[PDB]
Design an enzyme around this catalytic site. Sequence first.
Site, mmCIF file in Angstrom:
data_model
loop_
_atom_site.group_PDB
_atom_site.id
_atom_site.type_symbol
_atom_site.label_atom_id
_atom_site.label_comp_id
_atom_site.label_asym_id
_atom_site.label_seq_id
_atom_site.Cartn_x
_atom_site.Cartn_y
_atom_site.Cartn_z
ATOM 1 N N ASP A 197 0.857 -1.182 0.000
ATOM 2 C CA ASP A 197 0.000 0.000 0.000
ATOM 3 C C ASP A 197 0.895 1.235 0.000
ATOM 4 O OD1 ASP A 197 -2.247 1.840 0.296
ATOM 5 O OD2 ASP A 197 -3.378 0.104 0.915
ATOM 6 N N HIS A 272 10.990 -0.591 -11.810
ATOM 7 C CA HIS A 272 11.191 -1.903 -12.426
ATOM 8 C C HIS A 272 10.168 -2.822 -11.795
ATOM 9 C CE1 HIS A 272 14.941 -1.218 -14.576
ATOM 10 N NE2 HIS A 272 15.559 -0.820 -13.476
#
Length: 422
Positions: A197, A272
């Site tokens: 989160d 990434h």
Amino acid sequence: QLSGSVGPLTSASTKGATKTCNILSYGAVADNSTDVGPAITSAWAACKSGGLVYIPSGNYALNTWVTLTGGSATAIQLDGIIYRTGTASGNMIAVTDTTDFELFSSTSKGAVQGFGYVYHAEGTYGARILRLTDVTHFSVHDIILVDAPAFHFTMDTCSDGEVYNMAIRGGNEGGLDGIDVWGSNIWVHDVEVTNKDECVTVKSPANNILVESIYCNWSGGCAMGSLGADTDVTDIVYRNVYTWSSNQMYMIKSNGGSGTVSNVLLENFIGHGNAYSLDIDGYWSSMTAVAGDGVQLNNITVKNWKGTEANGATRPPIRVVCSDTAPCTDLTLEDIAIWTESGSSELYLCRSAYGSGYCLKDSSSHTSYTTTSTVTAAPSGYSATTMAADLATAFGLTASIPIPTIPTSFYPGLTPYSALAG
Ligand SMILES: *[C@@H]1O[C@H](CO)[C@@H](O[C@@H]2O[C@H](CO)[C@@H](O[C@@H]3O[C@H](CO[C@@H]4O[C@H](CO)[C@@H](O)[C@H](O)[C@@H]4O)[C@@H](O)[C@H](O[C@H]4O[C@H](CO)[C@@H](O)[C@H](O)[C@@H]4O)[C@@H]3O)[C@H](O)[C@H]2NC(C)=O)[C@H](O)[C@H]1NC(C)=O
Ligand SMILES: *[C@@H]1O[C@H](CO)[C@@H](O[C@@H]2O[C@H](CO)[C@@H](O[C@@H]3O[C@H](CO)[C@@H](O)[C@H](O)[C@@H]3O)[C@H](O)[C@H]2NC(C)=O)[C@H](O)[C@H]1NC(C)=O
Ligand SMILES: *[C@@H]1O[C@H](CO)[C@@H](O)[C@H](O)[C@@H]1O
Ligand SMILES: *[C@@H]1O[C@H](CO)[C@@H](O)[C@H](O)[C@@H]1O
Ligand SMILES: *[C@@H]1O[C@H](CO)[C@@H](O)[C@H](O)[C@@H]1O
Ligand SMILES: *[C@H]1O[C@H](CO)[C@@H](O)[C@H](O)[C@@H]1O
Ligand SMILES: *[C@H]1O[C@H](CO)[C@@H](O)[C@H](O)[C@@H]1O
Ligand SMILES: *[C@H]1O[C@H](CO)[C@@H](O)[C@H](O)[C@@H]1O
Ligand SMILES: *[C@H]1O[C@H](CO)[C@@H](O)[C@H](O)[C@@H]1O
Ligand SMILES: *[C@H]1O[C@H](CO)[C@@H](O)[C@H](O)[C@@H]1O
Ligand SMILES: *[C@H]1O[C@H](CO)[C@@H](O)[C@H](O)[C@@H]1O
Ligand SMILES: *[C@H]1O[C@H](CO)[C@@H](O)[C@H](O)[C@@H]1O
Ligand SMILES: *[C@H]1O[C@H](CO)[C@@H](O)[C@H](O)[C@@H]1O
Ligand SMILES: *[C@H]1O[C@H](CO)[C@@H](O)[C@H](O)[C@@H]1O
Ligand SMILES: *[C@H]1O[C@H](CO)[C@@H](O)[C@H](O)[C@@H]1O
Ligand SMILES: *[C@H]1O[C@H](CO)[C@@H](O)[C@H](O)[C@@H]1O
Ligand SMILES: *[C@H]1O[C@H](CO)[C@@H](O)[C@H](O)[C@@H]1O
Ligand SMILES: *[C@H]1O[C@H](CO)[C@@H](O)[C@H](O)[C@@H]1O
Ligand SMILES: *[C@H]1O[C@H](CO)[C@@H](O)[C@H](O)[C@@H]1O
Ligand SMILES: *[C@H]1O[C@H](CO)[C@@H](O)[C@H](O)[C@H]1O
């Protein structure tokens, strides 16, 4: 960007010299069994005005939550580890209505082990670990927050603060926010977050916030919002943010509402393995719609982003979805080179957004529109390095999470602004 100085007004050594309230003197027992809550409360009562609450090295059980309020020129030195044994809801540690404050560890090893997995294994959530509300002229640094049953660290209406040299490591699901912050003149830097989160997220109202050298190592990612009615967010800078295996590099979320978000700069991001990359979403489905024409976003600059995304065809690396009834204006997307980790194409999505860059329109008539661009070849210069500490696997939801060390490397090629305390 900051509007002035941040941090405590007087040093911890000065406060300590004034008066040091060692919790062992207030009934604390480092037996990892006797509730340390009461001791911290009694120590605070004695040292909240000019003194220093000191927690020596050892293992302590926190069975009842503490709410420390009304401090003035005070500090808390956490040199031991607190383990959650209490099961109540709320905040394990809350500091409110306090000015000139410092929460730190002199050894860089102070930690709070929240044991959130006990709840997560059962599909539930428990208390948040730390909440500062209406705290001014402060710094929180050199501490570790692990496995919060819910949120890890929230700064509710705080100002003139500096947060740095922290490691936050929680479970692998939503609802376990790392750092949530709203207020003014706050500097967050050199922090690493793991969870699923919020990494370092700004909420409304907020002005003059600088966030840099953030390492979201398998997290939800940084964001702004959810934004609703009467939003007022301005002068927000995020720079040098490295995001690995997360939901997004940056997301601005709203769904209806009103107010404005202006003068935001998001530069030097590397990502990434993420789901999304740049995701401005004015119709965020995960939140119930708010009455209004939509929050007006204005003068937002996204510059120098590089890296790769898991699948750029299913999730447009450049996604700028603004309110049809409240079109984004003055957005500047410049030098964003992201490529996909699978497939040979990706999409750039723009909806009712104005400015210059990629699928944005530089028109006079700010009318609504929807457009999708297919890119069939890797943007030039998308290549970016990775961080050595990138997690191969996260910490799940059913086993305790081992306490990490605070790192000294957050973004490629940069060093931390401040040396570790120990
Ligand atoms: C400070 O105090 C806290 C508590 O508040 C301590 O935390 C507890 O630490 C202990 C270890 O010291 C944990 O207990 C051990 O957990 C092991 C793993 O959990 C189990 O996993 C298996 C398989 O997944 C399941 O079958 C179980 O249901 C558990 O989920 C567990 O395997 C182990 O069991 C064995 O314990 C002893 C010795 O191994 C055996 O003799 C016994 O028969 C049993 O088979 C332990 O139960 C405990 O879970 C921790 N509590 C929490 C909430 O995580 C800290 O360790 C203390 N810190 C310090 C520094 O002292
Ligand atoms: C759009 O938003 C950006 C910020 O996202 C605004 O940029 C800021 O603009 C000022 C003035 O051009 C920059 O100058 C600064 O001035 C102060 C005081 O003179 C000085 O202390 C600084 O050293 C600097 O010179 C400011 O740096 C810049 N902010 C950033 C982060 O670069 C811009 O003004 C907004 N544009 C519009 C049209 O509203
Ligand atoms: C594009 O047109 C409008 C906005 O211009 C959208 O509401 C619609 O969904 C479509 O994608
Ligand atoms: C861009 O194209 C996508 C599908 O590829 C749509 O979902 C979007 O509304 C826009 O037309
Ligand atoms: C994919 O590759 C080229 C690169 O020049 C694109 O321009 C074209 O659309 C093709 O489909
Ligand atoms: C909204 O509608 C007007 C007129 O169709 C366009 O000029 C604008 O680019 C946007 O599509
Ligand atoms: C976007 O929204 C405008 C009205 O807000 C329409 O004119 C347009 O067709 C698109 O739905
Ligand atoms: C997005 O892309 C489509 C197709 O390339 C255009 O028709 C639209 O005007 C916008 O540029
Ligand atoms: C799809 O269209 C966008 C602009 O709408 C280009 O920036 C992109 O290269 C692709 O051709
Ligand atoms: C890219 O643009 C359109 C958007 O409607 C895609 O659906 C299509 O695959 C093209 O390659
Ligand atoms: C290809 O072009 C980009 C600019 O669009 C450069 O950043 C890169 O170094 C390469 O020359
Ligand atoms: C990615 O590439 C950088 C240099 O560009 C290295 O420093 C790093 O260790 C990784 O190989
Ligand atoms: C592309 O180039 C960068 C730096 O120029 C490397 O770090 C990356 O691993 C890839 O070789
Ligand atoms: C990120 O991944 C690269 C290889 O892709 C390593 O060079 C680096 O140390 C980190 O593991
Ligand atoms: C805890 O959750 C389950 C068991 O309840 C395992 O599959 C998982 O690996 C973790 O140990
Ligand atoms: C999670 O927490 C428990 C208790 O501290 C440890 O036994 C385990 O190794 C992991 O650190
Ligand atoms: C901080 O210390 C670490 C080792 O914990 C180094 O890897 C890093 O370069 C920095 O000096
Ligand atoms: C943090 O420090 C490490 C060295 O331990 C670098 O590799 C990284 O680029 C950043 O400067
Ligand atoms: C962290 O702390 C150092 C001093 O220890 C400062 O120089 C730096 O600006 C940051 O506040
Ligand atoms: C904390 O420090 C340890 C070594 O002491 C290192 O392995 C970690 O990567 C860093 O976070």
